[PDB]
Structure formats: C-alpha cells, structure tokens
Amino acid sequence: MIDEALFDAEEKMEKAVAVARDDLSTIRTGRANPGMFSRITIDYYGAATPITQLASINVPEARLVVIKPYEANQLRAIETAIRNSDLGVNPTNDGALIRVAVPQLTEERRRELVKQAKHKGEEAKVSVRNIRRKAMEELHRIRKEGEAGEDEVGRAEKDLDKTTHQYVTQIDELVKHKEGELLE
C-alpha cells in the first residue's frame, strides 16, 4: 500500500547501496584495506572461512599489510590462501605475523579492476531498479483497484522515481570514486 510500498522501497534501496559499497571495497587497490582480503578463505576445520574472521588485518603503511592470525597454527594456511589469491602479492612471515607488501598495480590490472568496479555498480543498479519496479507495480495495483486517489498515486510515483534516481546516482558515485582510487 502507498506509504508502505514507498518507505519499504527506500529502505531496500539504501541497503542495496550499503551492499554496493561493501562489494566495491573488496576490489584490490593501492592503499591496502582489510576489505580486499575479505573474499580470501581457508578450510577452517572443514568449512570455507573468510580469512578476515580468523585474523586482525592492519595497514601501518600504504603498501604494507600486517596480518595476525588468532590461532598461530592457522598462519600457514592463511598465508597460502593470500599467496594463491588474485591479489598479486607475495606474503612473508616472522613465525607469528604475516607481512604483506602491496605492489603498484600494472596498467593492465588497473583496466581489469576498473572493469570489475563498473560491473559491481551495474549489478547494484539493477537491484535498485528491481526494488523500484516492485513498488511501482504496487502503486499501479493501488490505482486500478481504486484504493487511493489518482493525484495521490501520481505524486507517489514521482517521489518513487526521484528516490530511485538518487540511489542509482549514489552507486555511480561509489564506482566513480573506486575508479579514481584504482587510477591513482
């Protein structure tokens, strides 16, 4: 129904934007961040487990990451996964700490990661548009069933369109800023 349809769609778009932000932060960049390690997993006692759940990742310099595994006997498997990952990094360890030097990306790899950023932006925008479509269908159903006034539904429709544009723009900005980060 009118308010419920609209307020729900807005809330869902906001979280679709939050989701897009977290997704974008997983892209390998200069100026290391815990996020780019978040999709790396190890077999943790029979279950694929994100390395970020098993260690404290620190960034004490733009190109130096220091990972402390919560369980010392997991260090090796963690280091291996990091080395096997597509991050293009070569870990070392001092028995207790994994040290990860972050190389400057190749021009080739930048273009690739830029492509990825744009793809994730596209996925998020399709989500936003589907959220809009569902709420717009409800507004249509409300109008034809005479459940609300015609002017009412028309105003809800432009508000809905406005809100959708706003969140699609936010996603484009997130991708835009990711790219700027990748080309730096």
Curated annotation (Swiss-Prot):
Entry superkingdom: Bacteria
Entry's localization field: Cytoplasm
UniProt GO molecular function: ribosomal large subunit binding
Chain residue ranges for the region called Disordered: 144-164
Any one GO biological process: translational termination
Record keyword Protein biosynthesis present: yes
Record Pfam families: RRF (PF01765)
Keywords of this entry: Cytoplasm, Protein biosynthesis
Parts of the chain that traverse the membrane: none
SUPFAM superfamilies, alphabetized: Ribosome recycling factor, RRF
Major subcellular location class: cytoplasm
Cellular component terms per the entry's GO annotation: cytoplasm
Protein family per UniProt: Belongs to the RRF family.
Role of this protein: Responsible for the release of ribosomes from messenger RNA at the termination of protein biosynthesis. May increase the efficiency of translation by recycling ribosomes from one round of translation to another.
Protein's recorded name: Ribosome-recycling factor
